Amino acid sequence: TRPTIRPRNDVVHKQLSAFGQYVAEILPKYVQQVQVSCFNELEIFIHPDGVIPVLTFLRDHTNAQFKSLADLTAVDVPTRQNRFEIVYNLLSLRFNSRIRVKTYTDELTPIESSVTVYKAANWYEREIWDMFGVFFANHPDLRRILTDYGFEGHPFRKDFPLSGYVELRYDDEVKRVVAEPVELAQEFRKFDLNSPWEAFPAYRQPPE
Amino acid sequence: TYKFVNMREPSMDMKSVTDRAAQTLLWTELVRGLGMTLSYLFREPATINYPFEKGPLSPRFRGEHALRRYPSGEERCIACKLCEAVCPAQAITIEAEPRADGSRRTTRYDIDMTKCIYCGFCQEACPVDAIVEGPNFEFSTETHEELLYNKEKLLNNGDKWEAEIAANIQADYLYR
Amino acid sequence: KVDDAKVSPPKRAEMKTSMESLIHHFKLYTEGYQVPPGATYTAIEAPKGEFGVY
Amino acid sequence: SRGEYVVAKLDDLVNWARRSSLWPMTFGLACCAVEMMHMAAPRYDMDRFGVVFRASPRQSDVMIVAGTLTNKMAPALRKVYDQMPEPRYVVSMGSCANGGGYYHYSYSVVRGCDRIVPVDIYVPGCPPTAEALLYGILQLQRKIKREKRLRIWYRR
Amino acid sequence: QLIAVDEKLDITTLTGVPEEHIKTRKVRIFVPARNNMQSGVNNTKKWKMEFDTRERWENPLMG
Amino acid sequence: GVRTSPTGEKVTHTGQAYDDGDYRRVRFSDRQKEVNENFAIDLIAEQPVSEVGSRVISCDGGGGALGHPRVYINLDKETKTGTCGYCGLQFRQPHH
Amino acid sequence: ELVQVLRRGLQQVSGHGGLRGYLRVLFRANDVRVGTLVGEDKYGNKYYEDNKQFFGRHRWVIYTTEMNGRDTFWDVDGSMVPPEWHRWLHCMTDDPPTTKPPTARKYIWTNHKFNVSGTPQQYVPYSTTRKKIQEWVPPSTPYK
Amino acid sequence: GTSVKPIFSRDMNEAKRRVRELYRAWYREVPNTVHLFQLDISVKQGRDKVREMFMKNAHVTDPRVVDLLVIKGKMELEETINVWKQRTHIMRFFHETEAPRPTDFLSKFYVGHDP
Amino acid sequence: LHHALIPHGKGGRSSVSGIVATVFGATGFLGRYVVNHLGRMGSQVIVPYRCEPYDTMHLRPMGDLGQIIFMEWNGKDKDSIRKVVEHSNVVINLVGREWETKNFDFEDVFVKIPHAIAQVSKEAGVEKLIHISHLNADIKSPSRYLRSKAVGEKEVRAAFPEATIIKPSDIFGREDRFLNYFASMRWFGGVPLISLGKETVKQPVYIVDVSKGIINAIKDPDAKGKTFAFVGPNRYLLFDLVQYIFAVAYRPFLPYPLPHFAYRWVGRLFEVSPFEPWTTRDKVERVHMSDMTLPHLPGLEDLGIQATPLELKAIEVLRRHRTYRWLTSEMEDVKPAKTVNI
Ligand SMILES: CCCCCCCCCCCCCCCCC[C@@H](O)O[C@H](CO[C@H](O)CCCCCCCCCCCCCCC)COP(=O)(O)OCC[N+](C)(C)C
Ligand SMILES: NC(=O)C1=CN([C@@H]2O[C@H](COP(=O)(O)OP(=O)(O)OC[C@H]3O[C@@H](n4cnc5c(N)ncnc54)[C@H](OP(=O)(O)O)[C@@H]3O)[C@@H](O)[C@H]2O)C=CC1
Numbered sequence A: 001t002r003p004t005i006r007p008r009n010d011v012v013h014k015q016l017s018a019f020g021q022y023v024a025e026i027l028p029k030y031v032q033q034v035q036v037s038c039f040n041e042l043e044i045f046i047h048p049d050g051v052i053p054v055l056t057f058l059r060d061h062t063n064a065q066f067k068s069l070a071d072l073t074a075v076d077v078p079t080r081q082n083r084f085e086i087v088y089n090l091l092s093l094r095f096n097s098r099i100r101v102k103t104y105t106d107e108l109t110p111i112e113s114s115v116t117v118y119k120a121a122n123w124y125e126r127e128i129w130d131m132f133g134v135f136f137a138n139h140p141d142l143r144r145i146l147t148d149y150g151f152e153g154h155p156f157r158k159d160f161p162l163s164g165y166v167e168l169r170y171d172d173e174v175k176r177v178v179a180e181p182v183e184l185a186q187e188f189r190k191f192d193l194n195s196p197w198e199a200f201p202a203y204r205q206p207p208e
Numbered sequence B: 001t002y003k004f005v006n007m008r009e010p011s012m013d014m015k016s017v018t019d020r021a022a023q024t025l026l027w028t029e030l031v032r033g034l035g036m037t038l039s040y041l042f043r044e045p046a047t048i049n050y051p052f053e054k055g056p057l058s059p060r061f062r063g064e065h066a067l068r069r070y071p072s073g074e075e076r077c078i079a080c081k082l083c084e085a086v087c088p089a090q091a092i093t094i095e096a097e098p099r100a101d102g103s104r105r106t107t108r109y110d111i112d113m114t115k116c117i118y119c120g121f122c123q124e125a126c127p128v129d130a131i132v133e134g135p136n137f138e139f140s141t142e143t144h145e146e147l148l149y150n151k152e153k154l155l156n157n158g159d160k161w162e163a164e165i166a167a168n169i170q171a172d173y174l175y176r
Numbered sequence C: 001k002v003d004d005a006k007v008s009p010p011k012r013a014e015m016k017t018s019m020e021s022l023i024h025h026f027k028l029y030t031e032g033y034q035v036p037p038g039a040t041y042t043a044i045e046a047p048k049g050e051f052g053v054y
Numbered sequence D: 001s002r003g004e005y006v007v008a009k010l011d012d013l014v015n016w017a018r019r020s021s022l023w024p025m026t027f028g029l030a031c032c033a034v035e036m037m038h039m040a041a042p043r044y045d046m047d048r049f050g051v052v053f054r055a056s057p058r059q060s061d062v063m064i065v066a067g068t069l070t071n072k073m074a075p076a077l078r079k080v081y082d083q084m085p086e087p088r089y090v091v092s093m094g095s096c097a098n099g100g101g102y103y104h105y106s107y108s109v110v111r112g113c114d115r116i117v118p119v120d121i122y123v124p125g126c127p128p129t130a131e132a133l134l135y136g137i138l139q140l141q142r143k144i145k146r147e148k149r150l151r152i153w154y155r156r
Numbered sequence E: 001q002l003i004a005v006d007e008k009l010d011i012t013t014l015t016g017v018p019e020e021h022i023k024t025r026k027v028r029i030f031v032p033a034r035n036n037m038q039s040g041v042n043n044t045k046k047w048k049m050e051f052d053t054r055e056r057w058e059n060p061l062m063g
Numbered sequence F: 001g002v003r004t005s006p007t008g009e010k011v012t013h014t015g016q017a018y019d020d021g022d023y024r025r026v027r028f029s030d031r032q033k034e035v036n037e038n039f040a041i042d043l044i045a046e047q048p049v050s051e052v053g054s055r056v057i058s059c060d061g062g063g064g065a066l067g068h069p070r071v072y073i074n075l076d077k078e079t080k081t082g083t084c085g086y087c088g089l090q091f092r093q094p095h096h
Numbered sequence G: 001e002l003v004q005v006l007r008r009g010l011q012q013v014s015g016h017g018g019l020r021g022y023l024r025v026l027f028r029a030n031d032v033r034v035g036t037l038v039g040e041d042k043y044g045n046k047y048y049e050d051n052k053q054f055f056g057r058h059r060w061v062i063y064t065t066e067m068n069g070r071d072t073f074w075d076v077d078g079s080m081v082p083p084e085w086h087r088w089l090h091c092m093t094d095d096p097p098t099t100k101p102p103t104a105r106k107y108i109w110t111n112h113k114f115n116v117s118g119t120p121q122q123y124v125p126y127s128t129t130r131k132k133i134q135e136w137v138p139p140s141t142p143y144k
Numbered sequence H: 001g002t003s004v005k006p007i008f009s010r011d012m013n014e015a016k017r018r019v020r021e022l023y024r025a026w027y028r029e030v031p032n033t034v035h036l037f038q039l040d041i042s043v044k045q046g047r048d049k050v051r052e053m054f055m056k057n058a059h060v061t062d063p064r065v066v067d068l069l070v071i072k073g074k075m076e077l078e079e080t081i082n083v084w085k086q087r088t089h090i091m092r093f094f095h096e097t098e099a100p101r102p103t104d105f106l107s108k109f110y111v112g113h114d115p
Numbered sequence I: 001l002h003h004a005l006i007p008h009g010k011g012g013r014s015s016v017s018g019i020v021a022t023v024f025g026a027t028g029f030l031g032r033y034v035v036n037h038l039g040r041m042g043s044q045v046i047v048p049y050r051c052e053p054y055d056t057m058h059l060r061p062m063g064d065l066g067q068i069i070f071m072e073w074n075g076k077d078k079d080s081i082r083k084v085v086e087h088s089n090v091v092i093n094l095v096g097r098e099w100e101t102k103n104f105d106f107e108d109v110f111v112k113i114p115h116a117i118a119q120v121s122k123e124a125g126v127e128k129l130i131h132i133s134h135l136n137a138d139i140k141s142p143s144r145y146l147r148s149k150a151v152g153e154k155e156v157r158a159a160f161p162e163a164t165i166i167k168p169s170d171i172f173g174r175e176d177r178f179l180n181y182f183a184s185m186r187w188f189g190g191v192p193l194i195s196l197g198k199e200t201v202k203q204p205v206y207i208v209d210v211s212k213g214i215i216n217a218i219k220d221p222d223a224k225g226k227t228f229a230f231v232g233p234n235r236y237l238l239f240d241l242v243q244y245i246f247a248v249a250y251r252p253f254l255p256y257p258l259p260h261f262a263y264r265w266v267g268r269l270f271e272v273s274p275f276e277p278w279t280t281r282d283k284v285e286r287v288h289m290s291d292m293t294l295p296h297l298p299g300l301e302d303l304g305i306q307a308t309p310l311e312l313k314a315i316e317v318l319r320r321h322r323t324y325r326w327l328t329s330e331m332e333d334v335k336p337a338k339t340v341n342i
């Protein structure tokens, strides 16, 4: 158990659990769940409407002071009714801590823009719009950031094909670069690697 | 533990003021930079005489791929397809069948060298040291098609470079 | 590397002598090791600033 | 014939002049540009072969495609290629430029720059070493040495 | 504020998929069968959606 | 073990050669076909059968860690020889 | 002193086989240095070293003027080095092939080839597999 | 019921108003686009293409979907006005190098296996 | 159909069309469009070239990997033609020069070379041959160019009875000599026209139309021994055509009549250029000669092509001939010229 196994830190676990309880008590209107991971990471699952309040508290409360936005991104889970999972990662330099805030949305429900709370969110939100198609309300300048001009679709969605739908090439007749339906000389070879035996008993699900 | 890089205060004595005025009016630090460049002018340059001299390399160097043989002249590859499964760029294509003598050998072994990232994962995965990345790196072509290697080309590369490949493997197989 | 052949590949001599080592080498280079479910944000002080993976 | 000898000699002179003064466009896309810089670095010193970077496409002879070409960027590469006066040459350096490379099966990547521009030399590697790029450039010089424009014009 | 939309959900116009790949495609929703070469059943737990097989041909170069 | 097709094209060790009516031969015109010369099947067929005084022998391809994974070959059948599934070498007991 | 540098230059031109050999090496390799002959190659390349130069300039090869079929007086490339001298030249080892010859196999090429791109000997890719689907052959006799 | 949250429009009337505003903007922009990009099409062709692109999404009955379509159209228009697009991007709407794929049964049966 | 030559895919770049085409004269104006249209659908294209390989580089991106094969050839060598047509089921001939050199006259490029191509392709078993002649090809025309075209057409028909012969008329495009030829006279200050161009009628055709017609004729099973005439939808007087050309380029149009002997003398004066001539006597004769009417020959519409009017594609050629002042002018600002139809 000693040499090859990652050591635990119970002090950080207890501190993060106490602070999660603190945050949940302060904002019952929006906090739905609090978790502390086995490697001491604190996550708070909230309601979408509380995106702006919660973050503001976490940035401005004297005991939180999470003044840095490390990252903001989305996760696509098609099996859920609310497809998209919005994740905020925040860093507090005063207390040398990190926090995660999660919420959810679907294709037609907008999320409140948090550029007023963190100016770093701007491009991040644009990226989430470009890769996933999640609209952010009251964004100062929302448009594509990563994809090509005129690109249709949202590539990071799970149902989006890996190679996309169109490819580009130079055409000498029209004397310009044109886009055409995609054709692959060698199709990408899909591998089925999942072993038919269970790996982790601790994560077994009920048999429904 | 931290240090300040720009938190120093200039001395205000008459001698220091006159020294700074001389620096401003006579350009002392500019002459210092000129002296640095002049010093470099009289050093020996670091250039080598390519192609007559070459840059140093290592027995671990990853270059052009090759398929190897046993000392009997039989191929080492048994068509397990581990290299194809591990290839991060899907650059390897393999087809196999029983040989006329019942041996388990490939009938197709292609490496797309314009797909390959030259990571060496294939030779780590190979259990018989059949596919290797050789030491050659001067194999530029004039056409795209010349970089689509089939089994004949790789077998040819192995036969051509085996003398150096075996010596490179002998000097590094104890680190693997 | 970690002395755990279900994550880190064994040495080639062991892979060419031991049955367990060959099985683990095969499965590691074909399917790869399974990682328990969960999400992490890991950051380092890269030379250009904080570099992170979620 | 005297005319054939004269055109052969003029052909050799023009080929020598063009191969001895090759000016690549200051142009890089990705990882491969670092090895291009190391080729320009003192250890290899491409300038000793008469190979000098120039920013403007109008004052360039060679385009080294060094890095991934994406769909968003392909029109710009084609445009700066078209603004090169002739004779012009293109070197495809690295797996990404040659055939897509690690990102071959991507929705946003052009599977090889040769779909956009004609290519003279392909330099394999991810990245090719600076020595490999130097080998490719000297191979391009040899290819320029082989060309016969004046002889072809004379035999017309 | 709520607006009480009465219609069935439809996001085809926003997904960016070409219409040929919307109308002529047939998907299969199924629990994949256990691979008969093995006894484990961990691959028969989730539902899968997959598309209908289309044409695959031989590349004239390299086959 | 090279050999030419009726078209004059060399037949590779996989046995592949373009047919008479196949246009793809044009890729070859004004150039060459790679055709690696050494045939592994013939070379392994030229190796002599090893005689060992045991029912079970071990093969690792030679070179120790530089060969193939070590396997054990039974030599109880007298009508045939034990063949390594990796290297192709043949083993037999002293018979007759 | 400067006079000793001039004398070094004079012995450098003297030791290259005279004036014409000096000019030949100057116009063939753009270098006029003199080094100990480590060895000679079966294709005509000569390999020299001088351990007093800094790492990188302490080993070099004067290429042959006549390779397999082509005139390599001016047209030379690094691909003309055979694999054993390739290992020595790139400092993957300290021992030359003369003192540590490579292991001999009957399938190793006896004649090194250079880069044959842009040449009638260039590699042309092709599929090495056989036909998968066989078509039915109609009978050659009339059916009625 | 159905408990949905709007983006900008509460019912379809406001959605059609926004659609009409966006169509006005595109109609006004087309001649400037033809001039600036030096396109070899006529202004009538550009306006016909704009109308066809608008008519492609005429069947929509969800105000939120219409709102997102208007947002995307505004993105495209702002992208064209600022010359962030190139001539290739504008000309991509016309598919000039794509061969006409037939729609009748017999030609499809002749060409291949796809429906 | 020899399974390797069975069509596959969706007719795109990576698809297989079943066409193996040898395109003689692919490094010219029409050849690049023909090769582009062939490589679009996934065809194997063989390009015989005698020029410098640099002059072929623009054809490289027109096909997938291995789909375009470049081979050296000589027009006076039949072994080379056999080498380059050995494995092709289609042979297209586009060889031609608007002037005569010291090594190749009109009869060499329009009679001898086409006849050798047709004969060798018939020997090799090539299934289809497409030959390109002129609409105005006549045995007794004033132009030796068209006389040679007619003789070579008869020779090709004799040597390859199942060949399709295509007769276009004054192709215009970006790299054409037709529209550029008239736009280039602005450098002399005035436009010389025989009879002020009032006795000449022209029916120019778009280059993409001709390329599409060639491709369709290859894919047409009943177009085997037919003869096609490729013409545009409108006929113009030469004066009106040149006036429209100068109006699209926004250049001052100053036409003046020049007698036939003087124009012939000017052509002879320009003919002594060792490089590509600016104009020749034969070009002068062909310019001021009316396009023929051949209603008994199948046209572009019989191959499914709707002819592109010059009013739709003239700007794409003539915008390059404008000054900076008129560079952004739109196409519908020129008021199309008057057509003398029927
Ligand atoms: C009065 C003047 C009027 C015109 C003014 C113009 C200037 C005159 C032209 C200058 C001539 C100099 C060029 C000659 C240099 C050749 C150098 C030689 O080394 O090249 C060889 C081959 O040389 C060429 O093949 C021939 C060069 C010249 C051919 C004919 C020259 C005729 C010029 C006469 C004047 C014509 C001007 C007409 C206008 C009046 C092979 O070298 P290369 O392989 O590369 O380098 C490899 C590097 N290595 C060795 C380290 C590996
Ligand atoms: N407006 C028009 O263009 C008219 C065209 N004509 C006919 O249409 C055909 C193609 O037209 P176009 O593309 O415009 O003509 P181009 O001059 O542009 O191209 C001619 C082609 O034929 C080749 N060629 C010419 N002479 C020789 C030769 N002696 N030996 C080998 N190859 C040669 C050229 O190769 P290289 O680069 O080496 O010179 C070039 O590839 C021609 O046969 C022409 O006669 C029909 C009516 C309209």
Ligand code: SF4
Pocket (backbone or CB within 6 Å): B083, B086, B087, B088, B089, B090, B091, B092, B111, B115, B116, B117, B118, B119, B120, B121, B122, B123, B133
């Ligand atoms: S080196 Fe890496 S990328 Fe190249 S073939 Fe091997 S595994 Fe694939």
Ligand code: SF4
Pocket (backbone or CB within 6 Å): B076, B077, B078, B079, B080, B081, B082, B083, B084, B094, B122, B125, B126, B127, B128, B129, B130, B131
């Ligand atoms: S090269 Fe090695 S890893 Fe790849 S199939 Fe052959 S034996 Fe297996």
Ligand code: SF4
Pocket (backbone or CB within 6 Å): D030, D031, D032, D033, D066, D067, D068, D093, D094, D095, D096, D097, D101, D102, D125, D126, D127, D128
């Ligand atoms: S080929 Fe490799 S090194 Fe070069 S740009 Fe692509 S990923 Fe980077």
Ligand SMILES: [Zn+2]
Pocket (backbone or CB within 6 Å): F059, F060, F061, F068, F084, F085, F086, F087, F088, F089
């Ligand atoms: Zn063995």
